[PDB]
Design a protein around this ligand. Sequence first.
Ligand SMILES: *[C@@H]1O[C@H](CO)[C@@H](O[C@@H]2O[C@H](CO)[C@@H](O[C@@H]3O[C@H](CO[C@H]4O[C@H](CO)[C@@H](O)[C@H](O[C@H]5O[C@H](CO)[C@@H](O)[C@H](O)[C@@H]5O[C@H]5O[C@H](CO)[C@@H](O)[C@H](O)[C@@H]5O)[C@@H]4O)[C@@H](O)[C@H](O[C@H]4O[C@H](CO)[C@@H](O)[C@H](O)[C@@H]4O[C@H]4O[C@H](CO)[C@@H](O)[C@H](O)[C@@H]4O)[C@@H]3O)[C@H](O)[C@H]2NC(C)=O)[C@H](O)[C@H]1NC(C)=O
Ligand SMILES: O=C(c1ccc2cc(Br)ccc2c1)N1C[C@@H]2[C@H](C1)[C@H]1CN(C(=O)c3ccc4[nH]nnc4c3)C[C@@H]21
Ligand SMILES: [Ca+2]
Ligand SMILES: [Cl-]
Ligand code: NA
Ligand code: NA
Ligand SMILES: [Zn+2]
Length: 805
Amino acid sequence: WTATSGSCKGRCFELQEVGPPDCRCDNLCKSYSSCCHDFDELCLKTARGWECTKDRCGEVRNEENACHCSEDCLSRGDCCTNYQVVCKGESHWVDDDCEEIKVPECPAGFVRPPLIIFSVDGFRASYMKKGSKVMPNIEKLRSCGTHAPYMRPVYPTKTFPNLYTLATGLYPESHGIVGNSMYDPVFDASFHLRGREKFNHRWWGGQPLWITATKQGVRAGTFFWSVSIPHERRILTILQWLSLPDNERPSVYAFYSEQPDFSGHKYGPFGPEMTNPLREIDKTVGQLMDGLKQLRLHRCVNVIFVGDHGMEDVTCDRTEFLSNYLTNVDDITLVPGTLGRIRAKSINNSKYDPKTIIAALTCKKPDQHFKPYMKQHLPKRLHYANNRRIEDIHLLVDRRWHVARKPLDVYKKCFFQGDHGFDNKVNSMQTVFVGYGPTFKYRTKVPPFENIELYNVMCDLLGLKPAPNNGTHGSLNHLLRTNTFRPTMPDEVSRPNYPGIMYLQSEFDLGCTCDDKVENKLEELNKRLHTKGSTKERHLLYGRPAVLYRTSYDILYHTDFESGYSEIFLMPLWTSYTISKQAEVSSIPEHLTNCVRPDVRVSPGFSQNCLAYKNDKQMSYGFLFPPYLSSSPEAKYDAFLVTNMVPMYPAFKRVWAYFQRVLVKKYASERNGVNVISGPIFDYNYDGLRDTEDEIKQYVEGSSIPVPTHYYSIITSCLDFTQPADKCDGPLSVSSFILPHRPDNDESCNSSEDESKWVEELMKMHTARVRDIEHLTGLDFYRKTSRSYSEILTLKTYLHTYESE
Ligand SMILES: *[C@@H]1O[C@H](CO)[C@@H](O[C@@H]2O[C@H](CO)[C@@H](O[C@@H]3O[C@H](CO[C@H]4O[C@H](CO)[C@@H](O)[C@H](O[C@H]5O[C@H](CO)[C@@H](O)[C@H](O)[C@@H]5O[C@H]5O[C@H](CO)[C@@H](O)[C@H](O)[C@@H]5O)[C@@H]4O)[C@@H](O)[C@H](O[C@H]4O[C@H](CO)[C@@H](O)[C@H](O)[C@@H]4O[C@H]4O[C@H](CO)[C@@H](O)[C@H](O)[C@@H]4O)[C@@H]3O)[C@H](O)[C@H]2NC(C)=O)[C@H](O)[C@H]1NC(C)=O
Ligand SMILES: O=C(c1ccc2cc(Br)ccc2c1)N1C[C@@H]2[C@H](C1)[C@H]1CN(C(=O)c3ccc4[nH]nnc4c3)C[C@@H]21
Ligand SMILES: [Ca+2]
Ligand SMILES: [Cl-]
Ligand code: NA
Ligand code: NA
Ligand SMILES: [Zn+2]
């Protein structure tokens, strides 16, 4: 109940939310149908439109007008935004040359530069270039301020998950808004675009920027606008709030535009009808910047122009129907469209089995335009699994396609020509970032970055301490002129042991054998040095990774590679090696095919054993340093040490062997040498974070050898590829992956073919940031370089996408 008998007189766009059943006058009262009776009359004035004309100049103040051209309007904070231009011979902000803002130039009373977040729905990255002729204001912000060629949204590339990631710095799996549509099994409640449940606080996790500001005594404009409030009114309200007295004035504001998403859906991302929405948005920016100028705030405010996701060409004909795949179609519930999420329709149906549904959706048709996944096998870069609102079965839909349950759904619900929601690496889903103002850099282009990084920066622009989030604070310091956040490296928690030769061969009873008893002061003196670390400078280029949890581990040196060997998990946590452009591949000699050698530096009780592998019919083993890249026949024996061994399904060994035999050398040739760090990952609970020993769900049968859920590699070289990886004087270049350790290759529909046709594609799907590997392993990489730590953070956030230009 709302007793809407009170009045909005004096209270138009009030900043505090008044408690029901008192009537509201806030920018969201319409959405709750709770505004007072006179809200339209007093607060949504439209008379005369939005622009001064010559004949209004110096007029008598008529309180009925949407905005004012009277002499008193400036002090009343309520002129039309073009007032000084029409009536005072001033120029529009867009017509002024840009001039570096070297220091903030703010009115007295301003304790910090305000931040204005200008968010545009469905603003595809390529519009910056492709629409630049019709967006003069946006193009001025872009070229005078700091810009990225594009910003990576989060998955799914939908509106609510992305705006709430911008507000919080969190992955959807963590903030809880994992779709535009959700069922929460614990609440037994549904979140829908239409309705009132979406307003309940229990959906909204983390701590949004506006709550962060309020709690730390920074005042915030209310971020949300009811759809019906026109953009011109939204802008004038922000401008009016900026004229409030110092003690009442917010320091952060949000504007939101439903365009160009709205027209993109109807016309496609590049339909000729899209020119208009782009003009209209640019006009709105112009109004804001003209209004800031009148307020003398145009060299004081930091403006962020940011999109939530792009827009792709999608039509009704490109729909796949689950009914062409499943018999039991009416026993499932499908969340459809540009992603699929499947659950049982009834929890009382004991004949529901996710494995049979998955198999009926797997590689069933030649040109199949979606791939089924259990959520925990989704690429780790998506971070889309650790929430009860995310259905166990997920469908990654190909760009340009839809999935639906049955055809009736599609023609009983072509209308739309654009949509979004696809894999956040897809180029058509990328969006925009421009920063403009005193705290941002002047005419600077920065590399593409992910929108999870922005919360930290917005907190930095406001002097706030960010809540715990998934940003890497310092990774975007290069966007900022000042207010940088100067992070320190985390402290190493565990120091390694450096074991020497401590065990005789006969102390080992591992059921392993090697044809190695085939036997000097030239060569013996030299293998001693190699096991002490003589060549560590070549294979460990950026220091050893720090271990950021309590554990027992050993550093193991070798001619060709160095490793940090875990006595707890019985395998390395990481293995580091350098492959120069000139390195040669060799095969594993015949006599050494089955060789595994005990490591006399490491006790039997902390070693793997070959018998567990013999007796486990499902499980085989691989090596972290590949025997194929040994520097010499003598060096190859090190590659067969039991301490270089890791458990691998034979189907996975197909992927791994190809990567080590073919791809490592190919990348070395291409990048002028590469440093490679490889290792296992254990994430049985799919939270994106290292599992402890007591969370391991799977061992090699009979033994305490834990099975990784994933294997990673980090591959580093010189950004200036004229320098070799091992002698690089400047910035580094990196690519990484986190490959699922799976007992079949069902993910790769072409996997019966040669590895040269499918392996690298699979690797690409599972591209990763070094930072993702850090969360998954508890290690900190790149500890000793010549580079600044901020530059290193940026490197750790880099995702190599393999999308074209
Ligand atoms: C991205 O960044 C984010 C933010 O930093 C990272 O997420 C954090 O990870 C932490 C470690 O996993 C996690 O800490 C846990 O907090 C538990 C209580 O937390 C409450 O309070 C916080 C702070 O205000 C709040 O944010 C939480 O809100 C969650 O839950 C509600 C819904 O229920 C949502 O509104 C909200 O969105 C959020 O949900 C998300 O997180 C939870 C996990 O907490 C998931 O369940 C959801 O799926 C969703 O993703 C909470 O209200 C705390 O109880 C935990 O402590 C247990 O474990 C420790 C181990 O040290 C143990 O010692 C403790 O005793 C305790 O164990 C006891 O409980 C167990 C389980 O019931 C039981 O088995 C034991 O026997 C014990 O009795 C834990 O410390 C932190 O909450 C989140 N923060 C957020 C916002 O999600 C995230 O990791 C980053 N991602 C990546 C890839 O890096
Ligand atoms: O008020 C805010 C807001 C919310 C959070 C915000 C966070 C920040 Br930070 C800044 C502005 C914000 C504005 N919003 C009003 C609109 C939009 C954002 C939400 C999504 N939505 C839809 O109807 C919708 C839109 C495009 C779609 N495409 N496909 N399906 C779609 C469904 C309802 C809400
Ligand atoms: Ca985990
Ligand atoms: Cl959705
Ligand atoms: Na076996
Ligand atoms: Na296959
Ligand atoms: Zn949309």
